[PDB]
Amino acid sequence: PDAVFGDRVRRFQEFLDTFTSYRDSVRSIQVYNSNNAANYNILPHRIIISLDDLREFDRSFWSGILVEPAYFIPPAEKALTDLADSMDDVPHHPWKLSFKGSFGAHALSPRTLTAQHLNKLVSVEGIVTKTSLVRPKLIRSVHYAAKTGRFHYRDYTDATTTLTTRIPTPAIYPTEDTEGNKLTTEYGYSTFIDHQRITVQEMPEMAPAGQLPRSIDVILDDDLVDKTKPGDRVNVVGVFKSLGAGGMNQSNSNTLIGFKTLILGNTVYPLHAARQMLTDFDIRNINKLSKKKDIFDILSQSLAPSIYGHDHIKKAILLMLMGGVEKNLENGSHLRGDINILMVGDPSTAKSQLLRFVLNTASLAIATTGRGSSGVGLTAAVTTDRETGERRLEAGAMVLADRGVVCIDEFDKMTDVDRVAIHEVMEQQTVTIAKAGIHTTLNARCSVIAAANPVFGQYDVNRDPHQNIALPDSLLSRFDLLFVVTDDINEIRDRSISEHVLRTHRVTIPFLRKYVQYAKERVIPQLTQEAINVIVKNYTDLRNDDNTKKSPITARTLETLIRLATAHAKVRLSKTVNKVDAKVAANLLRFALL
Amino acid sequence: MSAALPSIQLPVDYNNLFNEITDFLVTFKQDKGPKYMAMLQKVANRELNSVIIDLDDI
Amino acid sequence: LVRSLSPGDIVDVTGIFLPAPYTGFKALKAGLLTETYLEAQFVRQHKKLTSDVEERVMELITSGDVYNRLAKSIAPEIY
Numbered sequence A: 001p002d003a004v005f006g007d008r009v010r011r012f013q014e015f016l017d018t019f020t021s022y023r024d025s026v027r028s029i030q031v032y033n034s035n036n037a038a039n040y041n042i043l044p045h046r047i048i049i050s051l052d053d054l055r056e057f058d059r060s061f062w063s064g065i066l067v068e069p070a071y072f073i074p075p076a077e078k079a080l081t082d083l084a085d086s087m088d089d090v091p092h093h094p095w096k097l098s099f100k101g102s103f104g105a106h107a108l109s110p111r112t113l114t115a116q117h118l119n120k121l122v123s124v125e126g127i128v129t130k131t132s133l134v135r136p137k138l139i140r141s142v143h144y145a146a147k148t149g150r151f152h153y154r155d156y157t158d159a160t161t162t163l164t165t166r167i168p169t170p171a172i173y174p175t176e177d178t179e180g181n182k183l184t185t186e187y188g189y190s191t192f193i194d195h196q197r198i199t200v201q202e203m204p205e206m207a208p209a210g211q212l213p214r215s216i217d218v219i220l221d222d223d224l225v226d227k228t229k230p231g232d233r234v235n236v237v238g239v240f241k242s243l244g245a246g247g248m249n250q251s252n253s254n255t256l257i258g259f260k261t262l263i264l265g266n267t268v269y270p271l272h273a274a275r276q277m278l279t280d281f282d283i284r285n286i287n288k289l290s291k292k293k294d295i296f297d298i299l300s301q302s303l304a305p306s307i308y309g310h311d312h313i314k315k316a317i318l319l320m321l322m323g324g325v326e327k328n329l330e331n332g333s334h335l336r337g338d339i340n341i342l343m344v345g346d347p348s349t350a351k352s353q354l355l356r357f358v359l360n361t362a363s364l365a366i367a368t369t370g371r372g373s374s375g376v377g378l379t380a381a382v383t384t385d386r387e388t389g390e391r392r393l394e395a396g397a398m399v400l401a402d403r404g405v406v407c408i409d410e411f412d413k414m415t416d417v418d419r420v421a422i423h424e425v426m427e428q429q430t431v432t433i434a435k436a437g438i439h440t441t442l443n444a445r446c447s448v449i450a451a452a453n454p455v456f457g458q459y460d461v462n463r464d465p466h467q468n469i470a471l472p473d474s475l476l477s478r479f480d481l482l483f484v485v486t487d488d489i490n491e492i493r494d495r496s497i498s499e500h501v502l503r504t505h506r507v508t509i510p511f512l513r514k515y516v517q518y519a520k521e522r523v524i525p526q527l528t529q530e531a532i533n534v535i536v537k538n539y540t541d542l543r544n545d546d547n548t549k550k551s552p553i554t555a556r557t558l559e560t561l562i563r564l565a566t567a568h569a570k571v572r573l574s575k576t577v578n579k580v581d582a583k584v585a586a587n588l589l590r591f592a593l594l
Numbered sequence B: 001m002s003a004a005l006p007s008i009q010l011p012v013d014y015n016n017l018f019n020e021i022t023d024f025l026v027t028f029k030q031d032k033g034p035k036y037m038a039m040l041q042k043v044a045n046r047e048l049n050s051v052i053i054d055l056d057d058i
Numbered sequence C: 001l002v003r004s005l006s007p008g009d010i011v012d013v014t015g016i017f018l019p020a021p022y023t024g025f026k027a028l029k030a031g032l033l034t035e036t037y038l039e040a041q042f043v044r045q046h047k048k049l050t051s052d053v054e055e056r057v058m059e060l061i062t063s064g065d066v067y068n069r070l071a072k073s074i075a076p077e078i079y
């Protein structure tokens, strides 16, 4: 080699200053991993090269990485790995790259493919909805002649080295090397690696309205597997790559593409438009405003900046969204610790308004639109044969609902077959199915939010308040709060409405999402004899007043009456169940029932 | 054969373990005589076909 | 170790690991996929009439109390 190797070596003296700040980093990450492994009685080989250390002072070496990314990366690895041993060889796995930074206009939205940069560096974002299997793969197996005691060596190359199209080895395992010895193979010293494909859709808001979402796929490696839950705003970066013989491997080859698009990439990141690290400053201010004894009320009014009133509804949403705990019974069935509120109202009274903006601040809680095909909580045994001999129970809609919220619409405008499914997932946290395959109890922590409409217009007052939708009481008994939104007409009421819609055709949100997601990590009190003494008195008088009046209540309603106040103390961020929480819990039900 | 058929010399061989199983003869006298040899007699007379070579005896 | 497992056994197996070749349609498909299994070595199963149990049959005979203590015995978790 002298021409193709010279600017390697000139870079081999160049980039060693481009890890003046990382040559500490790459050895500090292993010296304790070498230490703890010797005193057990763990991290991969990630070497994040920024742009900044390779753009401030190298230009010929720079643009080679963004024009021809095929003669440069295995140079960068081979010159990396000697520094692993030249730093660390006394105690007795190739350290590939990641390359974070910016890029300067390669945010190819994959609705667009490129004519300029094929076989180059690409930055891609979107959502994944495939999540295929996991399967290991060999790279190097070592053979051993059991007679004469001598060893052997063999490496298999594939379409996995990411860059060099070597002569493949169309072989699985050889036998009988040039001797009369029956070949033995040591599998502890044979190395493996995994292999997982995933398809990425289009972020369906920035693709303009002329098409359905498109998709491509990406092969990643072990370092960031099981990181990709289906429904994450992911952002990957890798090389663009074609493989496969198009036009010769079969004869006459008419109308068959033979150039599959692939991405053999690295370093995914979740984004947000779970990881939000805050400093000492904002963590102290949120304690400083915690000292105020009004902030439960301020958060109610600072949520929906368009609509008047409904402060009973507005406190309920933030009470539900933050969530109440479920303490599992030891060697016993745990109870309902989910909360599940419901609404109904005569039309155009903002029943669906506030239902869509809970999805923006959802904190990884992606909901459906309530279109009630069978698949709302199940699998329907969709396997697609998974490359000839693998059957997979593909996750329909509960792998996204776990420790999150959902919302569905149009209950009475549904068939029967969804209603039997919402029976099971409410009485029990899990679904278990055996369609043409395997019985499997997979767990789910869900919390529905409902929206239906009454049937006969404005007939609520002149008839019974109950049966007003007459969907089965299997769900009404499994639900707690049936807010009936009024629309009464008062000349000061509507006049106040008329300007407030008009004033908006022309205490903050990201602080709000931090406060709740910090409050999911604080301890749960549950324990004060004072607060439990007053609520049962508060129950008994309405236990005299439920049956001689509107609506009979049951024992599970008491498990609400702990749970609302339990979450209400989670707003307080304290470990003492106070007295003041028990007054808002009683008063909220009093409007919900009267 | 050429092209990287031989490997590096590994210090971990098998002949050093082969003779170390030869000193798994009658020598373990802590645990009525050689106890793992006592189980060897209750198989040859054909009533049970599963020896148990644990890590406790190692 | 055969005939010693059951559907519904909350158990654990200890055993040794190896992958296996596929030897079918290995060129077009089946490039270097592996589809391994594990090989078993040991099973440590868990959570399983006048034969050293008669002492507790006497505890009902000596104490008596059929109509009420046994009534409080099954399902004492209600009102």
Ligand SMILES: Nc1ncnc2c1ncn2[C@@H]1O[C@H](COP(=O)(O)OP(=O)(O)OP(=O)(O)O)[C@@H](O)[C@H]1O
Residues within 6 Å of the ligand: A306, A307, A308, A346, A347, A348, A349, A350, A351, A352, A353, A354, A453, A497, A501
């Ligand atoms: N009670 C209300 N107060 C203030 N604005 C309202 C109210 N109801 C509706 N609006 C205005 O009307 C617009 C749309 O209301 P929306 O379509 O959500 O009614 P809805 O809840 O969907 O009723 P339905 O589900 O029966 O159609 C919103 O932009 C909102 O500003």
